[PDB]
Amino acid sequence: ERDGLFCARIFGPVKDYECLCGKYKRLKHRGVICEKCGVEVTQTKVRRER
RNA sequence: AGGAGGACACAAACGGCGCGCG
DNA sequence: GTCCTATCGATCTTCGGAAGAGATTCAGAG
DNA sequence: CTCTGAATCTCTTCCCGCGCGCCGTAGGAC
Ligand SMILES: [Zn+2]
Numbered sequence: 001e002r003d004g005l006f007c008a009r010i011f012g013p014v015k016d017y018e019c020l021c022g023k024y025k026r027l028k029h030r031g032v033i034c035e036k037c038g039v040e041v042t043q044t045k046v047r048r049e050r
Numbered sequence: 051a052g053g054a055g056g057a058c059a060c061a062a063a064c065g066g067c068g069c070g071c072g
Numbered sequence: 073g074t075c076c077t078a079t080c081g082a083t084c085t086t087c088g089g090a091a092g093a094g095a096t097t098c099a100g101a102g
Numbered sequence: 103c104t105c106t107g108a109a110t111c112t113c114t115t116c117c118c119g120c121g122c123g124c125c126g127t128a129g130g131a132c
Contacts, residue, residue, distance in 0.1 A: 016059075017059090025057095
């Protein structure tokens, strides 16, 4: 759930390299910001550091 | 006649309680 | 049945630790 | 009247692995 303790756009996406909203599923769109959910697509590991 | 035209990737978790062994 | 909110917001959470160390109070003490 | 004594307060601590095995949100409102 967004804006929660596990918000995707706050801490990071859950999928390996895919955004939560599913707009992008490739390294070709790595680093871009989606506007279907607001989550930033990057390496999911960053989710443990933000 | 002549002549003309014509989908890749991907293998199980975190805290108690109890027991037991070194 | 589902999904909810809230968590002794009318109790009594255990009495079979020891100690060791500070920290905090008190007590004649001038 | 506080000072510099004790005395009485709370807090911290307690070997290493290893296996079994269970056991693990709750009551209330639409
Ligand atoms: Zn997305």
